[PDB]
Amino acid sequence: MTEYKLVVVGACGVGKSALTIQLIQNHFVDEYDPTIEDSYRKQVVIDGETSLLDILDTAGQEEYSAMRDQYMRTGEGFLLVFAINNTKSFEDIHHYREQIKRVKDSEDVPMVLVGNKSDLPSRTVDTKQAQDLARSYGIPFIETSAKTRQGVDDAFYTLVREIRKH
Ligand SMILES: *CCC(=O)N1CC(NC(=O)Cn2cc(C(=O)N3CCc4c(cccc4OC)C3)c3cc(Br)ccc32)C1
Ligand SMILES: Nc1nc2c(ncn2[C@@H]2O[C@H](COP(=O)(O)OP(=O)(O)O)[C@@H](O)[C@H]2O)c(=O)[nH]1
Ligand SMILES: [Mg+2]
């Protein structure tokens, strides 16, 4: 029926792959490969509409440097992923959003802010900070854990709804 091109971005080690592998394969992996950059596919039904998801898991490992802008330009929605124990990954978020906007040539682009690794005890970024950042952009914030699967389906499903709103 419908095809949705999703892109998962965020700093190294936040859990972009872990989140993607959980959605499509329903398991958490003991050793991930940080170099792999590939598109993955998930079929879902949202609002009585079959949806095929073409999920691009970015890792900074493009064949050619020109593919960065092709990823953005061809992507319909973007998952802005940071880790709740990594302050630097949270601060990177505003850099990712501006570049997406810039190369897309648009102010309204479907995005969801995702705070991953909620299961961890040591946290440096609070929900309020992330919610205030998400509100300032006018997008939802969903807290996730790829380890427990908490909020993982809600993250991607909410992004598909945001794309339908565009
Ligand atoms: C563990 C490996 C992994 O998953 N990694 C390494 C990280 N590399 C990237 O995310 C590369 N990348 C950067 C952008 C991007 O548009 N910006 C990066 C941060 C930044 C920007 C502007 C000004 C200053 C900045 O940093 C201070 C914008 C990317 C976009 C896309 Br669609 C893919 C990769 C990518 C992830
Ligand atoms: N505790 C916990 N660890 C995670 C979670 N997601 C990813 N990780 C770990 O963080 C590391 C990086 O995950 P990965 O998906 O490779 O990050 P990526 O580089 O953004 O794709 C791995 O060692 C994972 O085990 C999570 O939700 N909870
Ligand atoms: Mg990865």
mmCIF file of C-alpha atoms and ligand atoms in Angstrom, residues 7-14 16-17 33-37 56-62 67-69 71-72 78 88 91-92 94-100 102, ligand 1:
data_model
loop_
_atom_site.group_PDB
_atom_site.id
_atom_site.type_symbol
_atom_site.label_atom_id
_atom_site.label_comp_id
_atom_site.label_asym_id
_atom_site.label_seq_id
_atom_site.Cartn_x
_atom_site.Cartn_y
_atom_site.Cartn_z
ATOM 1 C CA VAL A 7 16.029 7.825 8.878
ATOM 2 C CA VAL A 8 17.583 7.212 12.305
ATOM 3 C CA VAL A 9 20.268 9.763 13.240
ATOM 4 C CA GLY A 10 22.262 10.637 16.351
ATOM 5 C CA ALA A 11 25.742 10.361 17.849
ATOM 6 C CA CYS A 12 27.881 7.217 17.928
ATOM 7 C CA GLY A 13 26.788 4.754 20.632
ATOM 8 C CA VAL A 14 23.299 6.149 21.372
ATOM 9 C CA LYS A 16 20.411 3.656 16.594
ATOM 10 C CA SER A 17 21.082 0.056 15.542
ATOM 11 C CA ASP A 33 28.675 -3.613 14.657
ATOM 12 C CA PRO A 34 29.140 0.194 14.744
ATOM 13 C CA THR A 35 30.238 0.339 11.069
ATOM 14 C CA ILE A 36 27.109 -1.102 9.412
ATOM 15 C CA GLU A 37 24.918 1.358 7.527
ATOM 16 C CA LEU A 56 17.780 3.721 7.264
ATOM 17 C CA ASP A 57 20.165 3.122 10.179
ATOM 18 C CA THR A 58 22.935 5.713 9.765
ATOM 19 C CA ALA A 59 26.488 5.204 11.058
ATOM 20 C CA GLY A 60 28.657 7.798 9.259
ATOM 21 C CA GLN A 61 29.763 5.145 6.764
ATOM 22 C CA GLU A 62 28.512 6.296 3.352
ATOM 23 C CA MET A 67 25.004 10.219 -0.011
ATOM 24 C CA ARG A 68 24.601 12.158 3.276
ATOM 25 C CA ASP A 69 22.455 14.774 1.538
ATOM 26 C CA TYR A 71 19.712 10.354 2.805
ATOM 27 C CA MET A 72 18.220 13.559 4.132
ATOM 28 C CA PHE A 78 13.755 11.517 10.962
ATOM 29 C CA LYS A 88 27.203 15.142 24.411
ATOM 30 C CA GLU A 91 23.758 18.481 22.672
ATOM 31 C CA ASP A 92 24.359 17.092 19.156
ATOM 32 C CA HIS A 94 20.215 20.622 17.530
ATOM 33 C CA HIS A 95 23.034 20.193 14.989
ATOM 34 C CA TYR A 96 21.253 17.245 13.330
ATOM 35 C CA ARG A 97 17.907 19.080 13.132
ATOM 36 C CA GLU A 98 19.361 22.204 11.482
ATOM 37 C CA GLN A 99 21.251 20.198 8.835
ATOM 38 C CA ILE A 100 18.110 18.171 8.072
ATOM 39 C CA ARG A 102 18.856 23.097 5.667
HETATM 40 C C1 LIG B 1 29.271 4.392 16.165
HETATM 41 C C2 LIG B 1 29.111 4.893 14.731
HETATM 42 C C3 LIG B 1 27.891 5.814 14.540
HETATM 43 O O1 LIG B 1 26.781 5.395 14.600
HETATM 44 N N1 LIG B 1 28.089 7.227 14.272
HETATM 45 C C4 LIG B 1 29.268 8.129 14.121
HETATM 46 C C5 LIG B 1 28.353 9.299 14.056
HETATM 47 N N2 LIG B 1 28.525 10.018 12.794
HETATM 48 C C6 LIG B 1 27.453 10.818 12.187
HETATM 49 O O2 LIG B 1 26.388 10.919 12.698
HETATM 50 C C7 LIG B 1 27.757 11.526 10.860
HETATM 51 N N3 LIG B 1 26.679 12.439 10.492
HETATM 52 C C8 LIG B 1 26.667 13.729 10.789
HETATM 53 C C9 LIG B 1 25.491 14.294 10.290
HETATM 54 C C10 LIG B 1 25.082 15.788 10.407
HETATM 55 O O3 LIG B 1 24.334 16.245 9.605
HETATM 56 N N4 LIG B 1 25.617 16.648 11.465
HETATM 57 C C11 LIG B 1 26.559 16.121 12.482
HETATM 58 C C12 LIG B 1 26.773 16.955 13.729
HETATM 59 C C13 LIG B 1 26.930 18.430 13.401
HETATM 60 C C14 LIG B 1 26.213 18.969 12.380
HETATM 61 C C15 LIG B 1 26.340 20.357 12.058
HETATM 62 C C16 LIG B 1 27.210 21.151 12.809
HETATM 63 C C17 LIG B 1 27.947 20.592 13.857
HETATM 64 C C18 LIG B 1 27.821 19.238 14.174
HETATM 65 O O4 LIG B 1 28.549 18.636 15.221
HETATM 66 C C19 LIG B 1 29.091 19.476 16.206
HETATM 67 C C20 LIG B 1 25.233 18.083 11.550
HETATM 68 C C21 LIG B 1 24.785 13.235 9.641
HETATM 69 C C22 LIG B 1 23.554 13.146 8.948
HETATM 70 C C23 LIG B 1 23.130 11.917 8.421
HETATM 71 BR BR1 LIG B 1 21.444 11.805 7.467
HETATM 72 C C24 LIG B 1 23.916 10.766 8.578
HETATM 73 C C25 LIG B 1 25.126 10.848 9.262
HETATM 74 C C26 LIG B 1 25.559 12.098 9.797
HETATM 75 C C27 LIG B 1 27.182 8.386 14.039
#
